[PDB]
Design a protein around this ligand. Structure first.
Ligand SMILES: COc1cccc([C@@H](C)NC(=O)c2ccc(-c3ccnc(F)c3)nc2)c1
Ligand SMILES: COc1cccc([C@@H](C)NC(=O)c2ccc(-c3ccnc(F)c3)nc2)c1
Lengths: 388, 369
């Protein structure tokens, strides 16, 4: 039949919401939401659960789960969970596994952010994005098994090394190509910073933490929770108070803040309080001054000022090409088409497959209540499971 | 990787409860049970339905449905629905489609019977069972698309024809082989009768109506008229069937129902063959062999003792080739929608306040051959 080929095409497609893994999540979520002593007083619910008792226990055994991975060490912490350095028990392969608590996401009213984060890492097929091999879930958490990045974040690098300009040219250029890939996918990052810039086994850049990512409207804009204030742009610091819009330019601001921090040493709009940091970002024409002691070229000064302006005249409105032709980026080391295949400034010297010397030691769990009626706490997480 | 091959094996298997069609039923049922104005006041339910709004409307369009079939005529009626003679709009192929109301099955507390009925017709792969090509559903009904049997039931045949013994030998033997196939599958029919015995385009037998089937009042046996009971209760009804064709009336007939029940319990005394009736000694012997107490009945120790009974001897057919020989009454049918051998023959669920789950018993019913 002509309709049956169209139906089988939808189920085979991994982007589709009615794939085999998503359909299995629907069944697991339905049984998890229904299987309680109170809800089994309903005749329809009791007879359904008894039919699907044995097969759901079988599928839970066969499907991927937290018990398949040994937790080596906690390597990062966030709002709704943590990032664990893990080893798969069967294959002995090392991964970085991000956890996200379902209770905390439901409680704090933020349970849509992970969809774009899963899709960016799973489906970008880009060397600038951290690849997602497996996504899975249980009653408590969502899991995202990713390629481990043993070189560590760019906060680690700036603390340990006094960064010269040739190194800054490299890492900025990689950030430019990384954001261009995200902008090409139809997305604004909203939270570009050294914490979200990770270094691989070879010392080359990939981006992680795509929680603040939102898909652009048809114009190239987006219309509500924010990152750290040091790297946030002034147009974002007005839109948060009542409606407001902003485009890809807000990411390019943060590249200017990033390029300032490596060369100078401190953040350009730094203050003791948070209110001071916000005020300096709004007054960026007057407050942006380069320290006289600081070792910075004229071209790098020019590029930071080109990024750190009002949105309407900023560098990166009219494509990436104007950023790429800027004289700062000229060198006799790499070109734009081959930067990721050249030798990195800092190649990590790693002692083992579970070496986390480039990550700092992380310092050290309420569940859902057993409900009276149907609440549907697992329904927002149907479709999350993914197998490469 | 070893677990993923086992998981994909379960989903590919059409007998399995977690196949692709059953998983799609789970999604459709979840959306049907949840999509109401009251339940959308829950944030989790509203955001789930908005994600799966467009794709569920798309799958409902692509999947099989009642609108794909033109209803020619209603050919039977039952407790929870009807049997429609139908034609598929695309292919122009004629089928018999059984409807079953979801409201009536939920209300009267009987919503497990259809599983064995679907599985018997879908998966028997036997010439004695009516084949199920497609099973599907909507919010209101379950549907079972079957091969049309234009020869009609054996009630039709006994009314129209005065049935001789050579004809009775044939139709009884086909019933014996038909029940043997059902008994081989691990099932007791519980309701063997002329209404449930249909004749195909060639005048050969298939069984329909497998509602009373479970896995191991004119026609009901005395052991059922109280406990537990085996395959022997079907073999009683073959004796009642063989009596009705040769004699003309039911052996334990009464005016009231209470009279019919009493005569079945007193079957040693009440079973008398009319003196006017044209019946052999061997056919008398076989009816009496079937119409006894369960403990000494014909058909306890396999079908072989029934097959070797002298009544069934003839110079027409053998047991291995009976269904390939010429039938007694071959139907003379004028068209693919001829229903001359069939006689001429709606409250919904309330919009609920909370989650009730009225579609949950019907998850897994959809089947595509
Ligand atoms: C809002 O809920 C959250 C819960 C947990 C964490 C976070 C944020 C703060 N962290 C990340 O997104 C994040 C994700 C991957 C990695 C990573 C990737 C590859 N190799 C590594 F070695 C580490 N690092 C950091 C947020
Ligand atoms: C449970 O509620 C019910 C709802 C409707 C009906 C019935 C029972 C009484 N009828 C049947 O089962 C039944 C009878 C004949 C045919 C059939 C099969 C093939 N070719 C035909 F021409 C007719 N198919 C099915 C019960």
């Amino acid at each position: 039949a002509s309709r049956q080929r169209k139906l089988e095409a939808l189920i085979r497609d991994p982007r589709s919401p009615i794939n085999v893994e998503s359909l299995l999540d629907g069944l697991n979520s339905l049984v998890l939401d229904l299987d309680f002593p109170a809800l089994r007083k309903n005749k329809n619910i009791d007879n359904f659960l008894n039919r699907y008792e044995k097969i759901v226990k079988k599928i839970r055994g066969l499907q991927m789960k937290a018990e398949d991975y040994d937790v080596v060490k906690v390597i990062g912490r966030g709002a709704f969970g943590e990032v664990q350095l893990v080893r798969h028990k069967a294959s002995q392969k090392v991964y970085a596994m991000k956890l996200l608590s379902k209770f905390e996401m439901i409680k704090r009213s933020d349970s849509a952010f992970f969809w774009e984060e899963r899709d960016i890492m799973a489906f970008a097929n880009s060397p600038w994005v951290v690849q997602l091999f497996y996504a899975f879930q249980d009653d408590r958490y969502l899991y995202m098994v990713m390629e481990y990045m043993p070189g560590g974040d760019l906060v680690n690098l700036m603390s340990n090394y006094d960064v010269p300009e040739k190194w800054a040219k490299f890492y900025t250029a990689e950030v430019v190509l990384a954001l261009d890939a995200i902008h090409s996918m139809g997305l604004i990052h909203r939270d570009v910073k050294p914490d979200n810039m990770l270094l691989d086994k070879h010392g080359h850049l990939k981006l992680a933490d795509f929680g603040t990512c939102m898909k652009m409207d048809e114009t190239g804009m987006v219309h509500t929770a924010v990152g750290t204030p040091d790297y946030i742009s002034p147009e974002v610091l007005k839109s948060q108070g009542g409606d407001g819009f902003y485009g890809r330019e807000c990411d390019w601001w943060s590249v200017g803040v990033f390029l300032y921090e490596m060369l100078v040493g401190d953040t350009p709009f730094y203050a003791d309080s948070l209110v001071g940091t916000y005020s300096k970002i709004m007054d960026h024409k007057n407050s942006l001054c380069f320290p006289e002691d600081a070792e910075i070229s004229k071209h790098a000064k020019n590029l930071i000022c080109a990024f750190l302006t009002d949105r309407e005249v900023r560098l990166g409105r009219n494509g990436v090409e104007e950023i790429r032709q800027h004289p700062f980026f000229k060198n006799d080391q790499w070109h734009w088409d081959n930067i990721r295949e050249t030798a990195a400034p800092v190649v990590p010297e790693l002692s083992s497959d579970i070496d986390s010397s480039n990550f700092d030691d992380i310092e050290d769990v309420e569940t859902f209540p057993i409900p009276k009626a149907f609440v549907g706490n697992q329904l927002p997480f149907i479709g999350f499971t993914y197998y490469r």
